[PDB]
Amino acid sequence: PSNHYGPIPGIPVGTMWRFRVQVSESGVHRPHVAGIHGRSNDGAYSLVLAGGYEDDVDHGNFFTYTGSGGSCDQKLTNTNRALALNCFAPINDQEGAEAKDWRSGKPVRVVRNVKGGKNSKYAPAEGNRYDGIYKVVKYWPEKGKSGFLVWRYLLRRDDDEPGPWTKEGKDRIKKLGLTMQYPEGYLEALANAH
Numbered sequence: 379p380s381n382h383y384g385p386i387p388g389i390p391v392g393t394m395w396r397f398r399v400q401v402s403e404s405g406v407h408r409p410h411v412a413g414i415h416g417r418s419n420d421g422a423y424s425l426v427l428a429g430g431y432e433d434d435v436d437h438g439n440f441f442t443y444t445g446s447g448g449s450c451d452q453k454l455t456n457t458n459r460a461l462a463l464n465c466f467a468p469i470n471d472q473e474g475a476e477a478k479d480w481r482s483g484k485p486v487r488v489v490r491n492v493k494g495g496k497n498s499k500y501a502p503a504e505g506n507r508y509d510g511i512y513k514v515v516k517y518w519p520e521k522g523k524s525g526f527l528v529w530r531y532l533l534r535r536d537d538d539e540p541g542p543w544t545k546e547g548k549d550r551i552k553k554l555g556l557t558m559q560y561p562e563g564y565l566e567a568l569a570n571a572h
Contacts, residue, residue, distance in 0.1 A: 380408060380415075383423055384446040384485050389508060391539040394558045396493075396505040406508050407489050414446070416460025421484045426506070428459070428493040432523065436490075436498035438541060441512075445529035448522070452459040458529045461486070465514035465531075474529070476516035481536050489531070500543060505558060510537035536570070546553075 384553035386405050395401050402410045407424040409415050416422030427436060442566035454471035456553035466532055467475035477483055488509050493503035500509075512533040522528035540546040 381420060381423060382419065383421070385487065385511065385537075385539075386443070389468060390550065390554060390556070391508060391510040391537065391545060392501065392542040392554070392556050393508045394505055394556060396558060396560045396564070398426075398506065400559060400561060401489055401506050401508075406546075407488055410510075411458070414457040414461060418456050420460065420461040421463045422457065422460040424487040424489070426489045426491050427498070427501070427507065428491040429495070429497060429501075430493075431528075434497065436494065436500055436502045438543060439535040440515075441498075441533055443531045443533060444522075445531070447525065448526050448528060451527035452519075452522075452529050454529060456540045461514060461531055462517050462529075467516075474518035477514070480513055480515045480534065485511040485513060485536070486523050486533065488512045507542060509542055510535060510539055512536065 389404055389406055398410050401407045407415055407426055414422060414425045434442050434444055445452050445546045447453060452458060462469055464484035464486060465475055466477035466479050469564060490501050490509055490525050491506045492502055492504055512535050515532045515534050517529060517531040519529055
C-alpha cells in the first residue's frame, strides 16, 4: 500500500532510473515531484536527495536534510512532522529530539538524484538511484539562510544491503546486472530526433 515502510520487494540497493516518473511507478518514491513521501499522523516512507539547501551535507552513510515550507518559519507539520515521527523519540515541535536508540526508528527509503551533485560526491552522475534504508537520528530547529526558522534532520544508514558506492555494493550491482533504466521508446525517440 502507499504507506509501506521499508524496502520494496524486488528492488535492490543500486537500482537506477533515468526519470522521477519511473521512481514513482516502482513505488520506491511515489510522489513524482515532492522530495518526501509521508503522512503527518504516521511517518515518512521515502525521500529524494536532490540538492537545494546549501547547509546540508551528504557523506553517504550519513547526511543532514532540511524540511519544507516557510518567507517565514517552517513548522513541524505535514511532511516535516512525518519525518520527525520516524525518529525513535517522542515528537517535540519546540526543540526537536534525539534518539539514543536510533536504529529502532522507522525506516526511510532514500533515493539520490543527479541534482545533488554539486554538494554531494554520492549523487549519481545520471538519473536516480535507490541507496537503501536510513533512519532519523535527531532533528532540530534553526535559523535558516532566510533568517526564519527551518527544521533540520540528521539521517544515518541502517540497511543489510551494502551502500552502492562500496566495493561490496558495486559487486552486487554487477552480479545482479543492474543498469540505468530508461522508459520504453525514450532512447529510440532521442535517436530519431534529428
